Every structure is written in C-alpha cells, then in structure tokens.
Nucleic acid binder design. Structure first.
Ligand SMILES: [K+]
Ligand SMILES: [K+]
Ligand SMILES: [K+]
Ligand SMILES: [K+]
Ligand SMILES: [K+]
Ligand SMILES: [K+]
Ligand SMILES: [K+]
Ligand SMILES: [K+]
Ligand SMILES: [Mg+2]
Ligand SMILES: [Mg+2]
Ligand SMILES: [Mg+2]
Ligand SMILES: [Mg+2]
Ligand SMILES: [Mg+2]
Ligand SMILES: [Mg+2]
Ligand SMILES: [Mg+2]
Ligand SMILES: [Mg+2]
Ligand SMILES: [Mg+2]
Ligand SMILES: [Mg+2]
Ligand SMILES: [Mg+2]
Ligand SMILES: [Mg+2]
Ligand SMILES: [Mg+2]
Ligand SMILES: [Mg+2]
Ligand SMILES: [Mg+2]
Ligand SMILES: [Mg+2]
Ligand SMILES: [Zn+2]
Lengths: 121, 205, 203
RNA sequence: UGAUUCAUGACUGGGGUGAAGUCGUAACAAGGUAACCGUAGGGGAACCUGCGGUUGGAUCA
RNA sequence: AGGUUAAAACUCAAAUGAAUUGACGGGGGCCCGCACAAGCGGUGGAGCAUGUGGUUUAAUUCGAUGCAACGCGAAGAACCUU
RNA sequence: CAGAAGAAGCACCGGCUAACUCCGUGCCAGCAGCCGCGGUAAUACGGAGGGUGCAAGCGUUAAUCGGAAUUACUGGGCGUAA
RNA sequence: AAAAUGGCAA
C-alpha cells in the first residue's frame, strides 16, 4: 500500500475475541450446576467425559469439564470455574476448579495435587 | 533461599568439580564424579543447544551458590554496566563478600564462608557485615572478628587456601586474618572453563 | 405373597412415576395433573396383579401432589423387592451356550445388576465381541455373540429405543446399533418385546 | 407520535455438527456427455439443457 | 430477474500454490502371454469317490477361505493314530 | 545466654522443553497449550523410585505487549497461493 | 451400446 493510501485509510488491527467470554475477564467465576452428566468425546477419542452445565453469577450458562478421577458434583452444587477448553469436547470452554466451594478434591492423588485440590498427606 | 541438598550430585550433573567440598580429599574418592546422579545417570543423553546453555548457567550458579532470582538480577546489572556483559557478570559474582571470604582462605568452602559471614564473624572496613551478597569495592579490607579469630575452622581453611592457587587481586595476611580486595578480578584471572557467553545468550533467549 | 414383576416392567413403573413427578413439578393445571395421576395409578395396577397395602401406600405417596425424589427412591426400592432377578447360568452351561468359543471367560455380574437385568450382556474387548445371554419366551436360555464396533457414537439403540452411546453390532449384512453398555441398556429397557424384536431382526 | 436498541414469539429459511441411514453418482482420468464462468429455462437430488465466454481440457498414432 | 455495498454467531487446524516419486485412467505409443483368434478334449446335468460350507450331534477335534482355501496340513481316522 | 536446636515446599520429566524407569490400567479410567496419548510390555493416564526446574514459594486461570515482517511508517503482498 | 457402488482405521 502507498503512503497516500495509508494516510487516507490507516492499517487496521484485528478484533482478537476472547475464547472464554463467560468469565468476562475474571480469573474465575462461581456457578450453580444445573446438570451433571457424561458426554462422549469427538473422534478419534473414546471416553465418558464428566461435564456439568453451570449457571454463572453473571447469568451466562456454560458447560464446564470436571477433571480428575471421580467427583461429588450434583445438580445445585456451587462450583468455581476457570478458563480452559477441552479439545475433544465441543462447546466446553471451561474447567471446574477442584477443591473449591462445593467441588471436592480428587481422592488418593499424590502428584499434581495442587491441580486437583488435594491437601498434602 | 539456599540449597541444602547433597553437594556432589551438583558436581556430577555438571560433570566438573564445583569445589563444593573442602578439597582435603579428591572428589573421585568421595563420589563417582564422571557419572551423572540417579538411576539413568550412567547413560549420557545428547544435549540440545538450550541444554548446553542451561547447564553452563546452572554450573556458575552452583559454584557461587546463587538462586535464580538473584542470578537474574546480576545478569541485568551486568548488561546495564558498561563493557562486556559476560565479564561484568563474573566480576559481580567475584565481588560477593561470600566469595571473597572463601578466596581469602577464611572459609574452606563458599558455604562455610557463607556461614561465617551470616554469623557475623566477618568485618568489612572495620564494620560487621552479615550479608553474603554484599559487594566488596576495590581497596576494601575484609577481616575476621577478634572473637572469631580463635575458631579452628578458620585456621584449617587458611591451610587449604595455601594448597590452592592464590588470587592475584586479593592480598591476604594470615595470623592477622585480614585481607584486602586490591582490584576487581580480570577475566584472565578467572577460570577459562566457564563460558559466560552461553549465559548471556541464554538470558537473551 | 408380594406380586412378582419382571425387570422391564419395573423400569416402566419407574418411567411413569418420573412422568407423574415431572407433571407435578412442571404442570400448573390441576386438571392435567389429575389425569396423569389417575393414569399412573392405573398403570401400576396393570403392572401388579395384586395390590398389597405396601403397593397401596406407595401409590398413595405417588397420588399426593407433593411427591418427592426421596419418596420416589423408597417407592422404587419397595418395587425392587417385587422384581425377580435374572437367573445366571452355570459356567458349564454358559460354555455349552457358546461351545465354539474355547475356554470362554464369564465376567462376574453383580446381583443388583442381575436383579434389574432383562438380558445379560458383556463385551470382550480383546476380541471386540459383545456376548448377550437371555431367556426366550419359551424360557430356554439363549446366548448370542457378535462383533461390536470399537467406535462409540450417539444414536438410538435398537434394543431400548433410547438415544444413547451406541456401537454397531454385527452378529457372528447391515449391523444394528445398540448400547455399548448393556447394564445401562437394561435400565433403559421398559419392554421385553423390544429386545425380542431385536433378536428377531438379527435372525 | 416516531426512531433506535435489547429480549421474546406459533411457525419458517438457509447454515453447521453427529452412525457404517435412504436415493442416486455430479466432480477429480477424455471421470466415461472435457470442466468451469455469466445468464436463462427445467428437474427428487447431486444436476440437465440453451446462448455466449475461458483453458484452469485429454487424444493425434 | 437481480446488481451493488457488506457482516456476525458458530466451526475447523487446517485450507491453499507449485513441483516430486508412485499408483491409477472407459489417456497415447510400442511389445508380450493358450489373452484373443484357429482348434481338440472337458467341467456345469447322472451315479459314485473325495474335500468344503451348512445343518445335526454327547462329540461330529484343530487348521487352510478370491485368484494364491475346498483329493489343502492328512505320503493313507476300525482300535492305535486322536 | 542455650542449643542443631525452632524453620521446605510446588510444578514438571513424549516432542516443542531441562529431566526415565518399574508397576497398575487396557480407546476404559483418564491426560491435553499444540501435535497428540490410552484398544495388554504406556518415558504421554494413575502410583512409585529416580531426575529436572524453581524455592517461601510453586503452579493454574484471567489480562496486556512480545514472538507476529500475521495491517508490514520503520517492515509485506496481488500471473497460478487471499 | 451399456459400464453404478465400496464406513474409518493405521
Ligand atoms: K484415541
Ligand atoms: K423481533
Ligand atoms: K457433467
Ligand atoms: K449453463
Ligand atoms: K474464523
Ligand atoms: K459334464
Ligand atoms: K465334477
Ligand atoms: K510498507
Ligand atoms: Mg526471596
Ligand atoms: Mg460422473
Ligand atoms: Mg463429465
Ligand atoms: Mg474435466
Ligand atoms: Mg435438460
Ligand atoms: Mg442488499
Ligand atoms: Mg457333476
Ligand atoms: Mg488363521
Ligand atoms: Mg479313534
Ligand atoms: Mg529433553
Ligand atoms: Mg503396562
Ligand atoms: Mg497470556
Ligand atoms: Mg507487529
Ligand atoms: Mg504475505
Ligand atoms: Mg483457484
Ligand atoms: Mg487467486
Ligand atoms: Zn439400549
């Protein structure tokens, strides 16, 4: 582009939209589990992945992955969610923070305990 | 805020003696210096360029017993200071009171020198300084406290220092147990084994 | 003597109870609520040849507009007592059922699963086979094994006619999609005829 | 009395994703009628046909 | 008829250009083979032998399955073999 | 003055990326920033031993710029990739 | 002359 063209119309930057809009630029958000269920991943993966539908304090309703082995979440459980999509679960853009609010830490975890809300043995 | 683990493992990982022991006995007798620590230590994996740079930086840190945050600050200061950044960095590490006490022979190891400094056994220019990181200027006089002069460790350390090569930039008087930092060490004065360029490159990564 | 009900019948009871509870929860009209309530009572009466006081008590709780999930659970547990468990064949008999399979290994089946099992299905993952054992209308034990696809997909299952995680099943030429988990399938199944139709379709 | 913005609405349009569904086989080889562009008409569907245009068509013994 | 200006949600981790080695073509060329043509005798029908599938059975032991499994492993199952 | 006494954890170890094995599990349970990993000999899941990096912190999430010469003034393109 | 079709895998 010529300088004269740029003077008339300057270079324009990209929108750069967020991949975690429900957080609204917050590190975490609290929500209430409307539904807790399992969903199959997209190919080429096979599993029964644990997810919850959550209604956030901001009023957005989103699906959040429940990480680790085993959970105590039920409908009406109050959980904290953080950013983090699950590649093989379409429409799941958030993770549940283990060991926060109603969500319990993973049982019998000895490694990466801080990632699963497990206190030191 | 200090490494309190086994010393020889560090030397084994680096593959060179870091002088983390007194040197009363050879490192080979004390440990298998050649072999890296752990189960898979005998295996020698190929090291990446990043790996080579990391290992050089870790070696220098392990020699002077400096943690990453402080070492990073030294790098930043060395880059800000006029002249060769790599040479400036080594000069800063040499200027530490801890290192100076060891090089003067008051301490058998840098860790021993650290305890002496920390335990208020060392005076700089006639004032007690208990900070390991304290930077010694040229013409400063470093001396043991009169109370600490009687300590057996200090006398033993002085004997070991006689065995070691004497720093040109330091003038030390035994019995008096005082030393003078005549000048900042030149790059030539320091060992050529260290490759400071790798550290500078690593911090530009 | 308590009335004896088949597992599929019990699943049907559960469904009608859940419907009535949902009707109480989600319906604001009394007239509609009453019609469902009457229907639910009729269904249970059809399911049980004789209504004992315990059945009547359970019915009464169901009839009450203020039904609760915890109340339902207790009612279901009572109904579970009426349910008759699936008869597991002897290991030798099961070997006879699948003679061609050599040294066939039968997985241990939990009793509560066996209680609610209209049919028993297990998958040999190494062979990628699903084994189904059931008693026909004649009440003779019948066993079928077919290749089950490793892939699990979302679709309606031929046996239970419910949208579920299913895999293509080909008996020993189009396959039939059925639930990969037979235990879940058995819970979903409310009519034994549907399973029988699936067997007939396989032919 | 207008404008604008947001939410919602029987029903409806097209879009996307998902099973090894059903019907064909339009394209890629000259893909078995070279393909494609604009336009027009037609047809369950991919498409077919006319008119003009392009080569981003194979063949030539 | 439509033209022109011209988004978003959502979704994917590619899409794409040129060139390379193959393979393929109801592309071309040149050769060849019981490929065709020119012939002779068969198989498919019958009875029987033998193998296989299936069905049956207490068991009908196991293996071989387009060409390149099916008088195949078996150059020989009354018992033995098994 | 008395006495080593009163004072170490967190993440990570398939590639990118410093650091590897055993056992358990067997497309499950699970992991995952990307590429991907898991269907019975998993350095990728879970535990353990060992190791690496940081350290009174260490990880995770959110957010900005960088890397992005990927809006290119410095400093890009437009025959066939837009 | 006619001449259709063939899951995703690694
Ligand atoms: K997979
Ligand atoms: K409207
Ligand atoms: K055509
Ligand atoms: K046309
Ligand atoms: K996009
Ligand atoms: K004949
Ligand atoms: K014959
Ligand atoms: K420019
Ligand atoms: Mg600190
Ligand atoms: Mg065609
Ligand atoms: Mg054509
Ligand atoms: Mg064409
Ligand atoms: Mg036409
Ligand atoms: Mg318009
Ligand atoms: Mg014949
Ligand atoms: Mg075989
Ligand atoms: Mg015999
Ligand atoms: Mg490495
Ligand atoms: Mg294993
Ligand atoms: Mg960031
Ligand atoms: Mg830029
Ligand atoms: Mg460009
Ligand atoms: Mg093009
Ligand atoms: Mg173009
Ligand atoms: Zn089912």
């Amino acid at each position: 582009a010529t300088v004269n063209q740029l003077v008339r119309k300057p270079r324009a930057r990209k929108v750069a939209k967020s991949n975690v809009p429900a957080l609204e630029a917050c590190p975490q958000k609290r929500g209430v589990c409307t539904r807790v269920y399992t969903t199959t991943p997209k190919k080429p993966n096979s599993a029964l992945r644990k997810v919850c539908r959550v209604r956030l304090t901001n009023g957005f309703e989103v699906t959040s992955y429940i990480g680790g082995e085993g959970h105590n979440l039920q409908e009406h459980s109050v959980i904290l969610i953080r950013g983090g999509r699950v590649k093989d679960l379409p429409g799941v853009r958030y993770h549940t923070v283990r060991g926060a609010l109603d969500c319990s830490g993973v049982k019998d975890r000895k490694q990466a305990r801080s990632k699963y809300g497990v206190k030191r043995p | 805020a200090r490494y309190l683990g086994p010393k020889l493992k560090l030397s084994r990982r680096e593959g060179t003696d870091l002088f983390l022991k007194s040197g009363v006995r050879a490192i080979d007798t004390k440990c298998k210096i050649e072999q890296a620590p752990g189960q898979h230590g005998a295996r020698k994996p190929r090291l990446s360029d990043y790996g080579v740079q990391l290992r050089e930086k870790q070696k220098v840190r392990r020699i002077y017993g400096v943690l990453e945050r402080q070492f990073r600050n030294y790098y930043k200061e060395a880059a800000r200071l006029k002249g060769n950044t790599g040479e400036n960095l080594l000069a800063l590490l040499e200027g530490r009171l801890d290192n100076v006490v060891y090089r003067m022979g008051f301490g058998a190891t840098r860790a021993e020198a650290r305890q002496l400094v920390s335990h208020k056994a060392i005076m700089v220019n006639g004032r007690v300084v208990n900070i390991a990181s304290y930077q010694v200027s040229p013409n400063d006089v470093v001396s043991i406290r009169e109370k600490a002069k009687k300590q057996s460790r200090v006398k033993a350390a002085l004997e070991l220092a006689e065995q070691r090569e004497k720093p040109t930039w330091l003038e030390v008087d035994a019995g008096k147990m005082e030393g003078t930092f005549k000048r900042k060490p030149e790059r030539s004065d320091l060992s050529a084994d260290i490759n400071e360029h790798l550290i500078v490159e690593l911090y530009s990564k | 003597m308590k009335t004896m009900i088949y597992p599929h019948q019990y699943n049907y009871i559960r469904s009608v109870i859940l419907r009535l509870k949902n009707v109480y929860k989600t319906v604001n009209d009394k007239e509609t609520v009453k019609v469902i309530q009457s229907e639910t009572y009729n269904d249970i009466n059809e399911i049980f040849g004789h209504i004992d006081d315990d059945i009547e008590e359970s019915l009464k709780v169901l009839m009450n507009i203020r039904l609760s999930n915890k109340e339902i659970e207790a009612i279901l547990n009572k109904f579970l007592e009426y349910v008759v468990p699936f008869e597991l064949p002897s290991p030798q008999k099961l070997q006879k059922v699948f003679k061609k399979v050599k040294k066939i290994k039968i997985p241990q089946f939990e009793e509560y699963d066996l209680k609610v099992s209209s049919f028993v299905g297990w998958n040999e993952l190494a062979s990628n086979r699903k084994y189904i054992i059931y008693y026909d209308e004649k009440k003779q034990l019948k066993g079928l094994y077919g290749e089950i696809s490793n892939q699990v997909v979302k679709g309606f299952c031929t046996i239970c006619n419910k949208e579920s995680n299913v895999s293509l099943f080909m008996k020993k030429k189009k396959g039939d999609y059925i639930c990969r988990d037979s235990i879940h399938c058995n819970k979903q199944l409310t009519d034994i005829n549907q399973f029988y139709n699936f067997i007939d379709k396989l032919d």
